[PDB]
Amino acid sequence: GSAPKYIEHFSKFSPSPLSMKQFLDFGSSNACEKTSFTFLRQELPVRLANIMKEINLLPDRVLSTPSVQLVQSWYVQSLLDIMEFLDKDPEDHRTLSQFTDALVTIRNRHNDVVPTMAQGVLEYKDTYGDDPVSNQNIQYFLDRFYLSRISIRMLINQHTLIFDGKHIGSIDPNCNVSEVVKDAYDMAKLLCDKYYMASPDLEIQEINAANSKQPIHMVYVPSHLYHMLFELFKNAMRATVESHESSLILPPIKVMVALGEEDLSIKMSDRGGGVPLRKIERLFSYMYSTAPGYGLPISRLYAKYFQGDLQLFSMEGFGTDAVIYLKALSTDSVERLPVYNK
Amino acid sequence: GSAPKYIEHFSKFSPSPLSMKQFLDFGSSNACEKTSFTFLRQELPVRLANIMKEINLLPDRVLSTPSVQLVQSWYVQSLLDIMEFLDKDPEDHRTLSQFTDALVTIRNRHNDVVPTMAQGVLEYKDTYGDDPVSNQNIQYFLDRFYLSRISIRMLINQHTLIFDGKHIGSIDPNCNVSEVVKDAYDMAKLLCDKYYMASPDLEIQEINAANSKQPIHMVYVPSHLYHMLFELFKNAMRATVESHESSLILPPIKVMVALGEEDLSIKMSDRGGGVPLRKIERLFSYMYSTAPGYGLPISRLYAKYFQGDLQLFSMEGFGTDAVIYLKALSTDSVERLPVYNK
Ligand SMILES: CC(C)[C@@]1(O)c2ccccc2-c2ncccc21
Ligand SMILES: CC(C)[C@@]1(O)c2ccccc2-c2ncccc21
């Protein structure tokens, strides 16, 4: 066919990173489905081909594994689905309707990528070993692959949710940070009560530096923020409950939401006994956190996706602090995308 | 002369990193000045030549500057001072006495290296600019150069303090961490009261996981721990006082000392308004923290010298946490030394 042909062509284009303000203004009242179709039918192949060409640069030891080939076949098929709309007339309403239906099929086709790549990592460790040189290659590639996957899913979610026939797609222009914190806590508390028959309480403190009274709002994607907070709440609850099985007092989980002139920071403090520094630095490694699991590495990619970060600093024998760093301003929240270079 | 000859010879040897337990046991009752002389007359040239050969690999743009040449002339002279004792008889007490006097002269000859390298960094920025590529080369070299300098000064201090004619040289086998914290605080409070006419209070909390009652002691070099804590106290006081000039309540500085099964962690928490994440990552850069200053970068090297670390995580609009990570066990406290490789 022409799959290698399409990859080489669109990989020469660099992806166009969009800011949070561009996502908001494009999806507002002046939202034209035709304009979004013209942009996405070009930008989606560019992002697909860039990561698909980097997959080809992997060694044949990994490229010929069933896990990588299965995922690579999904990207080939999804790329071909977009190719059909290149010559189609954007002025035809049937063209726009079929394009939205085709994006949903691609989205559901890539729904089982996280467990599949986890099987690939386990296969590599049992086939070639777990050397620090291999960990860097796997960490470097999986970070770029997943971040690419997040960005593509973002574009698809914004198109299918807006043009379905307050919230701008998956974006809340007035996202109350504390409310998302409570939701992720409540879900983690539900799971923690069913399995441990006990759960720590929650304490939330807001620090709005410029407006001490005003609640802290931001423009963000609540799903991404929930995923990070839910993952951090599960870890902090597991550590708190297990480190106090012989004790009676169950320390609460303290969360501070701070809004500065540039950052919106969310610190989650637990007293779950802490973790030695040697092990903290390996909690974000796909290879080291795989056993015959990727909550922290993926959660950090969600934060980094809009120029943020997620950092851990523990104190062995006491507890652990987890901090989500987000950009406060929508103009500073720009997509971080991997680009194929030589 | 034969200065390039000695450099090429001893640079082929790798430095021998010593653990904290080796420092303690060698300097104990079975401390033989002859054995320390035989080791140091070989190990000191090896460490000198390794960093001196890496200095030669610098570009001639930096190698020909007066700052680098002045420091390089100190290392050439100090290397030649040790060469005189290679053929001397260790069984002669006059040989051991002159060797100790020669180490003191070398130690005082290298007393003005930090301000000299600071002048070199400022000269480079005004001569060739402050590009991110140049920052990595300067950061990579200065970290290794200073860490090498710390290790050499450590060996000299242990020899001159022990064989001068409870503490094992510069090492306290029962170093009370909280007491060093109070000393660094008291000195910072003295300077802060004279310049700001106000200073925050101190709060210390110890978490001894294995022995909740016992005070937290360790085997460490109190001078190094004081230098790190004093630097962090100055920053936390400056930020706290200045961020509350229009306010009346002056938040205290909270310090937690946690002793785990592997780590001894010291967290210093202030409410000095915090720093955006973008600027935190540049506080450890020699090039970015230079103006027409190196407290944090050098303090981190002291921590890393015995397999520890010093990390910052702030929250803009609230405050900053600073954490010193140290190895709890003396067997895990091994010298981290840069080695000249190809
Ligand atoms: C921001 C893009 C992902 C988007 O595809 C989009 C999604 C949803 C709503 C509108 C628009 C849009 N408008 C113009 C150009 C490009 C686009
Ligand atoms: C640990 C070394 C720096 C040292 O030079 C030393 C310093 C002080 C006291 C004793 C000894 C010693 N003893 C044996 C071998 C080597 C040495």
Swiss-Prot record, chains A, B:
Tissue expression from the record: Expressed in many tissues, with the highest level in heart and skeletal muscle, intermediate levels in brain, kidney, pancreas and liver, and low levels in placenta and lung.
GO cellular component: a single term = cytosol
Q: Which residues carry this modification: Phosphotyrosine?
A: Y195, Y196
Sequence ranges assigned to domain Histidine kinase in this UniProt record: 122-330
Q: Which residues form the signal peptide?
A: none
The chain residues annotated with the modification N6-succinyllysine are: K342
Explain what induces or represses this protein's expression. Down-regulated by insulin. Up-regulated by reactive oxygen species and cigarette smoke extract. Up-regulated by PPARD.
Keywords annotated in UniProt: ATP-binding, Kinase, Mitochondrion, Nucleotide-binding, Phosphoprotein, Transferase, Transit peptide
Note the SS bond partners: none
According to its UniProt record, which reaction does this protein catalyse?
L-seryl-[pyruvate dehydrogenase E1 alpha subunit] + ATP = O-phospho-L-seryl-[pyruvate dehydrogenase E1 alpha subunit] + ADP + H(+)
Q: Does the keyword DNA repair apply?
A: no
Any idea where this protein resides? Mitochondrion matrix
Q: What does this protein do?
A: Kinase that plays a key role in the regulation of glucose and fatty acid metabolism and homeostasis via phosphorylation of the pyruvate dehydrogenase subunits PDHA1 and PDHA2. This inhibits pyruvate dehydrogenase activity, and thereby regulates metabolite flux through the tricarboxylic acid cycle, down-regulates aerobic respiration and inhibits the formation of acetyl-coenzyme A from pyruvate. Inhibition of pyruvate dehydrogenase decreases glucose utilization and increases fat metabolism. Mediates cellular responses to insulin.
Entry similarity comment? Belongs to the PDK/BCKDK protein kinase family.
This protein is called: [Pyruvate dehydrogenase (acetyl-transferring)] kinase isozyme 2, mitochondrial
Give the species: Homo sapiens
